[PDB]
């Protein structure tokens, strides 16, 4: 179907359904983590064709990054679901690792035998999706600074913790050039066209009532005339 | 450092009529206009130059004189100008015979001349023409003189060719902060420029070339809008 | 000097009356399509009654030709009618001030395909063929007067114009209709006030802006 329209008879219920799926589910399993990652991918494609904004997606990015490197004082405002799954300093960060490689039913059936290769795979999948969605939407939205601020703080936490990854560093430089490029001028929403003076149109050019009035005029005129002629004759 | 007004919704400025005499405004008096009504026989009709010259000659007047088309187009450009939208001018037609006609800034004039002529004969006999919403009189015949119906602190100037040309924005910005301006515009086809010498303070010109009266009104009006920042 | 389409160098102003309703018919002689003069005629023709407004065209020509920039001789008038015919008007024309004589003159122009005076040295109304860029000057800045466009000060705009760049403006003379008539030609669109204007006051505002810009 066509997603780029404003209202769709089946897509907008599907949008809010995957919205509920994106938000309400609990994050206890890497299976559900990959489920959320591929939901992020499909809504990113939907907005590749449609170009709108989703705060549930930016909160989702926050949630996934902090539930990966929970391993607590820097971001306690998130209320995570699982504290046990963290990635220590054992990443290989080799370029020939497993890519996003979406084989859906296969991955969701062998997820519970979870290797750190697959954890870094879904992590980098979320990383590439976040980079693409930022580059297509986030720089164009006006609140970009405070939208991306918690993501930027989590990324600086990543770099200070590890200092070995490269895609976080490149995303840092990209959002840095974005915040150096944007001007961030305050709002001017309430400023309207002054209304004009009202205008009006001029007006220019009952049969029973008309006939009544004409007969009254006839009666008056002929009665007065007959009285005058009577009195002339009498004198 | 300066707070906002509590209401920021746009509201229509109040219509400036002859009753109110305080608010600074502009007044245009299309003077020496030619609006006579004749009776042919079954029906009355407004005198026009082009169509009826044998009976105009039977009157004996000038086909050159009896021209209402220029008053018509002057009224069009005036009441379509942006300052009428802002509600800051009102107009008065001073007929050659002696009528004073007050035209409210809210009226929507019919633009084809036969409709305008029917409107004008209905006005010059009925003395008043009401809106189709019918709560107000737009075209009111009022009584001489214009000094009796003008604002109290006003300046009355004539549009003459032989006066030295000035810049209309300069003159309007030279005016005081509550001293309104009233321009006498000669709505004659062709004639002398000395009819309102007992009414006015001074004469001004706007170009080294003669103008049509509609263009003169448009020049003065756009200079006024440029001055008052519209 | 009298400006013409053959000169394409000197700084000048060009006005374009887009979709201007100048339509004729023969009833047993000719007639212009007047909106008020006949309505059952337009209903027989199937054409919309509220479109044929040569009165508005006449108002625009009258204001433009009597404007002082026209007397100084710095403009030229092109009319692109609703049926696709280009009409060229020179700054030396004394147009009729009456709608009836204007109607007769337009229908005689449409049925002669040329108009020359009794002086007969050079024509006044020229029927010529679309497009218009063949007769436009070289360095033409093309603007359309639209309401949805941002507002500008005409003084600042003509100041920001170049030295010898001529200026061409496009105004729609129709009653109701969208302003997307000449997007294939035009560079940009501007607005003039926060209030919706008309054709006559639009061209008058622009010619007075040009007058005060070029110090006439």
């Amino acid at each position: 179907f066509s997603t780029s329209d404003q209202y769709h008879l089946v897509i907008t219920p599907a949008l809010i359904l995957m919205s509920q799926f994106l938000e309400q589910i609990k994050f206890n399993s890497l299976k559900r983590i990959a489920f959320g990652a591929v939901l992020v991918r499909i809504v990113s494609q939907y907005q590749r064709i449609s170009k709108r904004y989703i705060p549930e997606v930016v909160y989702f990015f926050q949630k996934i990054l902090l539930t990966f490197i929970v391993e607590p004082l820097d971001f306690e405002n998130i209320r995570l679901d699982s504290y046990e799954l963290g990635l220590p300093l054992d990443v290989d960060f080799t370029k020939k690792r497993s890519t996003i490689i979406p084989l859906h039913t296969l991955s969701t059936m062998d997820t519970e035998a979870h290797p750190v290769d697959q954890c870094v795979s879904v992590l980098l999948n979320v990383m590439e999706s976040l980079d693409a969605t930022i580059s297509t939407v986030w720089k164009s939205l006006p609140a970009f600074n405070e939208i991306i601020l918690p993501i930027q703080q989590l990324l600086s936490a990543y770099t200070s913790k590890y200092s070995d990854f490269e895609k976080p560093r490149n995303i840092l430089n990209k959002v840095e050039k974005l915040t150096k490029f944007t001007e961030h001028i305050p709002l001017a929403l309430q400023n309207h066209k002054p209304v004009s003076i009202p205008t009006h149109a001029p007006k220019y050019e009952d049969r029973t009532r008309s006939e009544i009035n004409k007969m009254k005029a006839q009666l008056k005129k002929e009665r007065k005339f007959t009285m005058k002629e009577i009195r002339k004759d009498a004198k | 450092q300066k707070a906002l007004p509590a209401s920021l919704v746009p509201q229509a400025p109040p219509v400036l009529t002859s009753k109110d005499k305080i608010t600074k405004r502009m007044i245009v008096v299309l003077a020496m206009a030619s609006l006579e009504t004749h009776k042919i026989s079954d029906k009355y009709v407004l005198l026009n130059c082009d169509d009826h010259q044998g009976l105009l000659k039977k009157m004996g007047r000038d086909i050159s004189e009896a021209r209402p088309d220029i008053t018509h187009q002057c009224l069009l450009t005036l009441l379509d100008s942006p300052i009428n939208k802002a509600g800051k001018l009102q107009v008065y037609i001073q007929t050659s015979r002696g009528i004073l006609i007050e035209v409210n800034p809210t009226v929507r004039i019919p633009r084809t001349f036969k409709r305008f002529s029917g409107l004008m004969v209905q006005l010059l006999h009925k003395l008043s023409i009401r809106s189709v919403n019918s709560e107000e009189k737009l075209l009111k015949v009022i009584k001489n003189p214009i000094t009796d119906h003008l604002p109290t602190k006003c300046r009355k100037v004539t549009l003459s060719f032989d006066a030295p040309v000035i810049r209309v924005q300069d003159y309007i910005e030279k005016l005081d902060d509550d001293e309104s301006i009233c321009v006498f515009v000669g709505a004659m086809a062709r004639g002398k420029d000395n009819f309102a010498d007992e009414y006015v303070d001074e004469k001004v010109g706007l170009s080294n070339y003669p103008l049509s009266a509609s263009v003169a009104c448009s020049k003065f009006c756009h200079g006024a809008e440029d001055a008052w920042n519209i | 000097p009298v400006l013409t389409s053959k000169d394409k160098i000197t700084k000048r102003m060009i006005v374009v009356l887009a979709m201007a309703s100048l339509e004729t018919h023969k009833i047993d002689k000719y007639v212009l399509l007047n909106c008020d003069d006949h309505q059952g005629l337009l209903k027989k023709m199937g054409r919309d009654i509220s479109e044929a407004r040569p009165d508005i065209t006449h108002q625009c020509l009258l204001t433009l030709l009597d404007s002082p920039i026209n007397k100084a001789g710095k403009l030229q008038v092109y009319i692109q009618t609703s049926r696709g015919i280009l009409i060229e008007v020179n700054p030396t024309v004394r147009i009729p001030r009456t709608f009836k004589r204007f109607s007769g003159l337009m229908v005689q122009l449409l049925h002669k395909l040329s108009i020359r005076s009794v002086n007969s040295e050079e024509k006044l109304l020229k029927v010529i063929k679309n497009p218009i860029t063949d007769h436009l000057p070289t360095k033409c800045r093309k603007v359309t007067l639209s309401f949805d466009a941002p507002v500008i000060r005409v003084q600042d705009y003509i100041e920001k114009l170049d030295d010898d760049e001529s200026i061409c403006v496009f105004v729609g003379a129709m009653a109701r209709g969208k302003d997307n008539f000449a997007d294939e030609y035009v560079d940009e669109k501007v607005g003039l006030s926060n209030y919706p204007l008309s054709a006559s006051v639009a061209c008058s505002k622009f010619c007075h802006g040009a007058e005060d810009a070029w110090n006439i």
């Binding site: - | 019919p110 409709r115 | 909106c35 509220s50 009653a175 008309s198």
Partner: peptide
């Protein structure tokens, strides 16, 4: 409301 359209008819 009205903006440069002329007027109605009967």
């Amino acid at each position: 409301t009205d903006r440069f359209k002329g007027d109605d008819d009967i």
